[PDB]
Structure formats: structure tokens, C-alpha cells
Subunit: 237 residues, 4 copies
């Protein structure tokens, strides 16, 4: 299976697989069952922003999700990602729907990775920012139901012609270039990512969520990873 | 054939195809016959740095090549790259040798493209920098004789076991992700690239040189582009 | 007196001091009489963005001003700023009104200067960006009528309690730190600045305008520089 | 007294004031007696690099110091700097000698602070980099014995005309602009800093060390803060 590290914005509590009994943000290390979660009030129809931060010195993966009214949730988990991730990864955004649904619209996404050595501040780095997506966004690998287009947004999951989200959808967008997430020579390796999103639903309950993830470079959507599995995992173990 | 915009660091004067009769830096738009050249004193075995700068406002492609002793050559050419490049490109480095030879060693390479739009300092951007290359550099597409590895450098053209550069060599390195080099909405599209290089030769004359290039995404080394064509062009037209 | 290089967003034509007979963007080198102008359609009450770009290689100072509907005005002037600016400068924003008036509201301002030297992509650099201004903005030197605060904006010229802009107003905001704008060793000295602005008027004609400027470090608003002199010049020479 | 947060590279063990019995890196929150230390092998005459990283999400101040042979020490301490630092600070480098001495040469220094909000990735930021210092470095406030000059370095403590360091020296360099280190509206505030240094001594033991610090904007060298106090504190409490 793929190796996955992810920060989930999980809009649907699947308490039977260890989600807490509320919408939450979580840090997922090789399992959909988050190593750490925090309560998260998803604001239906509002534009959220998620920031994710790690470096190899503090070894603490942190995420904060906030909305324009000021409400924010934060989660941090102490982990040495050198022991989990492969040296080369792809980075991406993933989302799903199941029996319940929501728009999983990404309005912008930025990522920076840096490997800093012992010379000065000489550095390998990758930084990309999309504040608008294009129709034929050649620097993104879209998987599953994900599309970009003319409104300048990335729809991770399927949205019908009348605008409304669909159930049992899964899709992802990975930056096209592999990322050198660690390198043994480097003194510091850090990454950060930010994405803005608009989760809207008129369902009885929104589901399932959006994740920033880092995977093996050849990562593909696990079969059947709609719903609770966020397009990240083949199962809920 | 391919579409090419390039800044060449041309170490060998091929005066029969329009080179001036001295080593030179030149701006190449869709031909090896540079639209503009400046005399360049290549300092054998010294680490040089090249800076290439363009934006869509001034519409002037500029390059400087310099050495630590302060010697510099500059060339600028007024051109609207919107009418030459496709919207999506790959960026890269190329070098060659022919009857005369040189190492075409790249020590570092950075590139930044930005599209800045109708509104605030919001932006799509790509920035990479390599101050050390890896042995298996997964975010670089190596073509022809280009290799990376263990000394942290990129060797664009063939170098034998005994450290000596080979003749009739041609190699390139392209960044893995396509680059959105222009977009009609953008008020400013800019790019800049820096590379450091070490050209060293024990030949009677060093050849052929090194270029930073921007090409169609599917650009491949043209057949017969060793020597004076710098791995960029199928012919000298 | 002071030394000034400026890009003016000139909302009021003072044809008796060399303005064209339309609102315009212009590049000012040591005089209010712009060396170069382009016609500019100021869209009353709309948020505009200005980008100013210079480097020591192309020696071309360029500016574009644009609005979200896509309308743009560009001006570029070939000038070697090494022979005009002192080595150390302060950078800032200026605006004024006179008999006619307008708000001169700055919503954001960013600036980057870099000196890139004889060797690798090593560098002195300064980058700041304000996307929200604070009430007591300690890294800004406010002069004349300039104020910040609580709406996250910078008001360059006086605005009364009832939200209305005042006449005969002049104000500026300079970044607190001096900027090393050129250095003889540097192979590339570049700067770029972006600001977003909201010029709104209920006057018969809006005036005077907004400029990004670079000055001697000790620059102060010249006496009598309201109105057509944009808070930059002591006279119209 | 001033409020000080610092990362000390402490070359001299003053075990009577709580230093461990070896050279160490430490995190100092309002006291020279580090909240956390790690053993550090200072490499006499070698160029070290120090990286310091904090963000308001993880609330973990981390530092790593390394040298070209690969040896590195790291220290991290969990602290919410919002509860310690004033909103506006200056940032600086500090060093001292006492009865023993060393060169406290800084070869480069970079700093970035960012306040990120809940809009997109809109941000206030300050970033500066010095990879070479100038004689009259107008964007640095030198205090005590600190000087810059023509060799491109910052000597924090006194060095005699023959090149040799002096005892009982203290000096600091602060970036000229105040830094907005936190702001209640921001979702993330982060800072990072890197400096490279060359500590050389021919004494019986080198002393005393170099610190990156963040202080009240009006911070000055406490009287008598040579030696063990690193120019940071009026006393060893
Ligand atoms: Ca769930
Ligand atoms: Ca040639
Ligand atoms: Ca005017
Ligand atoms: Ca000590
Ligand atoms: Mn969950
Ligand atoms: Mn040529
Ligand atoms: Mn004018
Ligand atoms: Mn100590």
C-alpha cells in the first residue's frame, strides 16, 4: 500500500473507526485513525484556511484551520517524519464524499519544502502557489473525480452541472513534481502548506472531508476509499 | 520542431553561423543565431554565475554572467515572450561539446516564475532551487549525456572516469514540472533563473557552451545538436 | 533637496507642468515632470494594484497599474538608477490632494530588494509585506497626514470622520529600515514593489494621486508639495 | 529590564550559574539560565551555522547548530512566546568575552517573520538576509563593541588590529526595523533565523558565546553583561 502522512479536515464523525464524536482536524500517520485530533467546527459555506507546518528539528507536525470569523482549531503531533516518509514524495490534496456529501472546493494551495545544509543558508527548495487553478493545470496530477476549471478553483470531488456535490466521490490533486522531503545530509528539512477551501453542503450532515497529504511518488487513490477513507487509505485500520 | 528561448553562454565562436568572433553571451529566440550578443571572457576553471531575468512589463530579457573577480558580461533583448513561448513550458539547462570540449558542470540552479493577477499580490508561482544535486534527482528530467551525482553537481555533458570532458557530447536537464510561463489574465508574468557553472577545459579552445532554455513541455534534444547548436536547435538557421 | 525616483499614479492632469491631458502613470526621475507616461484610466472606488519592477541588468524601470476588470496601464523607462540614487535609500508611498481630492488608501504594500553578488545565488535582501496595516505600525515612518489603523489600511492623505477625503493634504509612509538599493560588487541589484490602493472621489475630478518612491534616507515631505507635486517635490522643475 | 528570548551558543560552561559542564546550545527565556540545553562541540576555527525556528501553532522553539563535518546539536523548548515577548520586538545577534575570549564573527544572518491571517495566504512579513555586511551597514544597529567591515563580516566582539580577539567585550547587532512578532488577529506567526559564525580562539578555553535574540524594541546592552551574560542579561538570575 501507499505510505500516507496527512492532515485531515474531517467533517463527518465515523466513531466506529475511532473518529471523535465531532467534526475534527487530525494528523494521520499511515492510518485514517488519526494519531491526534482536535475538535473542529466546520463552517458550512464559508472559506476556510488550513496551514500545516513541519520541520525536522522540532519534529512536530502542526496544523491550524481557521475561518474569517476567527474560529480556529489546531492539532500538533510529535513525530519524526524521516522514519515514515520515503525520501521522495508527492504532495497533494484529497477529498471524499460517501452517503453524505459536500463540496470540496480548493481555492488556493501553496507548498514549500526546504532542505538546508551545513554550508550557509544554501538550500534546496521547492515552492509552488496556486491562488487560481486553470482548466488544463499541467503542473497538477488530478486523480479520481478531481477537476480544475475556469472559475479558478479545484473541485476535489464531483460536482453536478447544477452546482451540487455528489456522494461516493473521491478525488485528489498532486503537484506534478516529486518533492525531496528529506535528505540525510541536510541539517533542516521543513515543509509548509496552506490551502483555502470552501466546504458547502445541504445534506443532513456534510461529509467527508479534505486532506493535505504526502505520499509515495506513485500514489494513487486506493480502490474504495470514498467516504470515511478520504481517498487516502484502502481501509480503516 | 521545438520552440526555444535561451540565454547561451557560448564559449566557441562559429563565425560561419553568425557568432561574433569571440566567446559571448547571447539571447536566442527560436534560433541559434542570437538576436543579441555581448563579448564574454570565459575564465577557464572558475565558477561563474549566470542570472537571467524577464518580465512581461518591461518585455526585456536580460542576462549577466559573472565570475568572482568581478568580470561580467551583460546582454538584454527587447522581446515580448508572450508571442513566442507557449503558455506552458519546461525550463532547463543545456550544454554541448563538439571537436573542442569543456566540462559543463552546473553547481546550482534556481528558477522562479510568477503570474501576478488583476487583484492584490496574489499569484501563481513556482520556485525551485538546487544548490546541491542528488544522485537520483527525481525532479529533474535528464536528457542526452546529462548526469547528476555524489559530488552534488550536474554534469551536462559527458565527463570520463579520469575527470576529462568528452567531445561530441550533448546533455540537458529540465525541471520535472511544466511551468505556466504566461497567462493572459496576469498583469505581470516574470521569471528569473540563476545557475552557477564551472567550465574547464585543457583544449586548445573550450567548446561549445551552456544555455538556460525554455521550451515546449515535450522538448527533447534535437538530433545532431551537439557542438555549435548547444543541444537546443536542429540546425543553424 | 531630496533625491527622488518615483512611479506616480497621477489622477489629475496639470498640463502646465508637463502632464499629459489625461490621468496617467509616469516614471519620475528627480522631477515631477515624468520622463515617461502612459494614459491611465483611474476607476473611481475600485481597488487597483500597482507593480513596479527594476533591475540593474536591463536597467529599465517598469510599472503597471491594473484593476480587477483587467484594464491596465504600463510605462517603462530606461535608466541606470546607479547614477541617480544614493547607495542607501528609504522606500515609501506618497500621496496628495489639492483643490480636488480623493482618498489615497493603501490596502497593501510589498517591497523586495536584492543584491546578488560575484558568487552563487548569495545575496543581501530585504523583503517586507503589509497586507494589513496596524494602528501603531512601528516599522513604518508616517509623515504629513498619513495615518494607519483599525481598518487594516494606510490612508496617505487626510480623510475626515465622515469618511470624506480632504483637500490640500499630503502624506507619506516610508519603511523604517534603510534599504541598500545598490552596491558596486553586486552583479544584480533589483527591486520590486507592489501596492494595492483604493482611490475614490466624489469630486468633479479626482486629485492628485499616489506614488511609490525611493529617496535619500532622510527624505521628508517638501514644504508646499501638496497638490500636483505629490508630496515628492519642492517645485515643478 | 529588557525582555529577552534567545538561543545561545555558549562556548564556556559557567556551572556555578547553571550551565551544564560542557559547551552547549541553549534556549533562554528571560534568563541566562537556559530552560533547555544540549551538549555542543564548538569547532574552533570552523564556520558553523545556526538555524532557529518557531511558530505559534507548534509553540516550540527549536535551534540546531552544525558544522561542515556534519556534527550538529539541537535543542527545542515548548513555550508560548505570545506570553513572553512584547508585540513589537527587535531581533539581533549578541556575543561576549570575559576572562577568556574568542572571535565572535558572523558571516551571514537571515531572518524571516510572518503573520498569517484568516484570509488566504495573505500575510505580513519581514525577511532580511545579509550574506555580506558592509562597513556602514545602515540597516543594522550596532551596540557595544560590534563592528562591520570590509571583509564582509560582523564582528560582535572586539578584535585587535593583529586579528586577535579581546576579553571583556560585548557587542550586538540588531536589525534596524522593529518586527511585529505577534499580532492577535493572526492565525500563524512564525519566525526563523539562520546565522553563520566563526568562533576561533587560542585561549586556554574559548569564551563566551554568541546568541540570536529577540528583545524589546529599545533593548540595549545591560551594563556589565560581558562574560557569562552574553550581552543579554544584567545578571545571572
Ligand atoms: Ca470521518
Ligand atoms: Ca558557438
Ligand atoms: Ca498631476
Ligand atoms: Ca556560559
Ligand atoms: Mn477523522
Ligand atoms: Mn553564439
Ligand atoms: Mn504627472
Ligand atoms: Mn549557557
Amino acid at each position: 500500500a501507499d505510505t500516507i502522512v496527512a492532515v485531515e479536515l474531517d467533517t463527518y464523525p465515523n466513531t466506529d473507526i475511532g473518529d471523535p464524536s465531532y467534526p475534527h482536524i487530525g494528523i494521520d500517520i499511515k492510518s485514517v485513525r488519526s494519531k491526534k485530533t482536535a475538535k473542529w467546527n466546520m463552517q458550512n459555506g464559508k472559506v476556510g484556511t488550513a496551514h500545516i507546518i513541519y520541520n525536522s528539528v522540532g519534529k512536530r507536525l502542526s496544523a491550524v484551520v481557521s475561518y474569517p470569523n476567527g474560529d480556529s482549531a489546531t492539532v500538533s503531533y510529535d513525530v519524526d517524519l524521516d522514519n515514515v516518509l520515503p525520501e521522495w514524495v508527492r504532495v497533494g490534496l484529497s477529498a471524499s464524499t460517501g452517503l453524505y456529501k459536500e463540496t470540496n472546493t480548493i481555492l488556493s494551495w501553496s507548498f514549500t519544502s526546504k532542505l538546508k545544509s551545513n554550508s550557509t543558508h544554501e538550500t534546496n527548495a521547492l515552492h509552488f502557489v496556486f491562488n487560481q487553478f486553470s482548466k488544463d493545470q499541467k503542473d497538477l496530477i488530478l486523480q479520481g473525480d478531481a477537476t480544475t476549471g475556469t472559475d479558478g478553483n479545484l473541485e476535489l470531488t464531483r460536482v453536478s452541472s447544477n452546482g451540487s456535490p455528489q456522494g461516493s466521490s473521491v478525488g485528489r490533486a498532486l503537484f506534478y513534481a516529486p518533492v525531496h522531503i528529506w535528505e540525510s545530509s541536510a541539517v533542516v528539512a521543513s515543509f509548509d502548506a496552506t490551502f483555502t477551501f470552501l466546504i458547502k453542503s445541504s445534506d443532513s450532515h456534510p461529509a467527508d472531508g479534505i486532506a493535505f497529504f504526502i505520499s509515495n511518488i506513485d500514489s494513487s487513490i486506493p480502490s474504495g476509499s470514498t467516504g470515511r477513507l478520504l481517498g487516502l487509505f484502502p481501509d480503516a485500520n
